[PDB]
């Protein structure tokens, strides 16, 4: 046993999925650290050395990592593989990135099955000595992912169809919302330096009032102030922080991809539940 196969990923969600497929035969590390904003990340000297020492670099594609193309020119002789081949993209419909794909495809557990297949394929090609282990681990992990669907639908099952409105800060939840029959409302379509957010906050305030939507959310890598501003003006609850663009650290609340799907869905469902402060009417 010499130095293992080294895989570097752009961000933490892919790192955790890949590390489950790799098991103990490869080391998988993320360029961005937990909590860091991933769309407009600015790579550092540490990041170049890490990628340059890898045997394989994995990235999302779908224009997620706006920094990756420039970064990857500084890497010599390290193969890269996008993990989203075969994903059916949803478009960004408004704002300066209209017509660019929504990149957050991993928020659908059924899409995670496609991520798994693509990562498995790349590991098997680039580290064939461990092909049997990658295949066995990919199959076992896909089984765990498939087992999420029914309990996730159960958690959300008490919100009738017309009330299934998911109001978040970044429009990062479109793939999850489509799989579970939610209508999405966002404060900005995709993370970026951009115009138009104050007007969209006013727009979203109007939608929440019209439809009596009870809860709004923020996400773990961006500011909660606009969501709190919506809560103040509408009387909707601030439902707390959802996880989409990053895991937490290994000793935090969202250490794994599976914990990210579970906690995000549980936090959404808690926002619609009536189990707060009760009196005897
Ligand atoms: Fe995002
Ligand atoms: Mn880990």
From Swiss-Prot:
<feature type="binding site">
    <location>
        <position position="170"/>
    </location>
    <ligand>
        <name>Fe(2+)</name>
    </ligand>
</feature>
<feature type="binding site">
    <location>
        <position position="104"/>
    </location>
    <ligand>
        <name>Fe(2+)</name>
    </ligand>
</feature>
<dbReference type="GO" id="GO:0007155">
    <property type="term" value="P:cell adhesion"/>
</dbReference>
<comment type="subunit">
    <text>Monomer.</text>
</comment>
<keyword id="KW-0574">Periplasm</keyword>
<dbReference type="InterPro" id="IPR050492">
    <property type="entry name" value="Bact_metal-bind_prot9"/>
</dbReference>
<feature type="binding site">
    <location>
        <position position="245"/>
    </location>
    <ligand>
        <name>Fe(2+)</name>
    </ligand>
</feature>
<keyword id="KW-0408">Iron</keyword>
<dbReference type="GO" id="GO:0071281">
    <property type="term" value="P:cellular response to iron ion"/>
</dbReference>
<dbReference type="InterPro" id="IPR006129">
    <property type="entry name" value="AdhesinB"/>
</dbReference>
<keyword id="KW-0406">Ion transport</keyword>
<keyword id="KW-0479">Metal-binding</keyword>
<keyword id="KW-0732">Signal</keyword>
<dbReference type="Pfam" id="PF01297">
    <property type="entry name" value="ZnuA"/>
</dbReference>
<keyword id="KW-0410">Iron transport</keyword>
<protein>
    <recommendedName>
        <fullName>Iron-binding protein YfeA</fullName>
    </recommendedName>
</protein>
<comment type="function">
    <text>Part of the ATP-binding cassette (ABC) transport system YfeABC involved in iron import. Binds iron with high affinity and specificity and delivers it to the membrane permease for translocation into the cytoplasm. Also binds Mn(2+) and Zn(2+).</text>
</comment>
<comment type="similarity">
    <text>Belongs to the bacterial solute-binding protein 9 family.</text>
</comment>
<dbReference type="GO" id="GO:0042597">
    <property type="term" value="C:periplasmic space"/>
</dbReference>
<dbReference type="GO" id="GO:0006826">
    <property type="term" value="P:iron ion transport"/>
</dbReference>
<dbReference type="GO" id="GO:0046872">
    <property type="term" value="F:metal ion binding"/>
</dbReference>
<feature type="binding site">
    <location>
        <position position="39"/>
    </location>
    <ligand>
        <name>Fe(2+)</name>
    </ligand>
</feature>
<keyword id="KW-0813">Transport</keyword>
<dbReference type="InterPro" id="IPR006128">
    <property type="entry name" value="Lipoprotein_PsaA-like"/>
</dbReference>
<dbReference type="InterPro" id="IPR006127">
    <property type="entry name" value="ZnuA-like"/>
</dbReference>
């Amino acid at each position: 046993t010499a130095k293992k196969f080294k895989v570097v990923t752009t961000f933490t969600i892919i790192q955790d999925i890949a590390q489950n497929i790799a098991g103990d035969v490869a080391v998988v590390e993320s360029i961005t650290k937990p909590g860091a904003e991933i769309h407009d990340y600015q790579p550092t000297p540490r990041d170049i050395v890490k990628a340059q020492s890898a045997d394989l670099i994995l990235w999302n594609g779908m224009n997620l990592e706006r920094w990756f193309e420039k970064f990857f020119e500084s890497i010599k002789d390290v193969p890269s593989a996008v993990v989203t081949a075969g994903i059916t993209p949803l478009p960004i419909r408004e704002g300066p990135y209209s017509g660019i794909a929504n990149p957050h495809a991993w928020m659908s557990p059924s899409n995670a099955l496609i991520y798994i297949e693509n990562i498995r394929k790349a590991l098997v090609e680039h580290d064939p000595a461990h092909a049997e282990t990658y295949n066995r681990n990919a199959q076992a992990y896909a089984e765990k992912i498939k087992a999420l669907d029914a309990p996730l639908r159960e958690r959300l099952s008490r919100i009738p169809a017309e009330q299934r409105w998911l109001v978040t800060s970044e429009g990062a939840f479109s793939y999850l919302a489509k799989d579970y029959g939610f209508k999405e409302v966002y404060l900005w379509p995709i993370n970026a330096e951009q115009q138009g957010i104050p007007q969209q906050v006013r727009h979203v305030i109007d939608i929440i009032r019209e439809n009596k939507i009870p809860v709004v959310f923020s996400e773990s890598t961006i500011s909660d102030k606009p969501a709190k501003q919506v809560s103040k003006e509408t009387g909707a609850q601030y439902g707390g922080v959802l996880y989409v663009d990053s895991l937490s650290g290994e000793k935090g609340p969202v250490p794994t991809y599976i914990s990210l799907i579970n906690m995000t869905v549980d936090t959404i469902a808690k926002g619609f539940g009536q189990l707060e402060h009760h009196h005897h009417h």
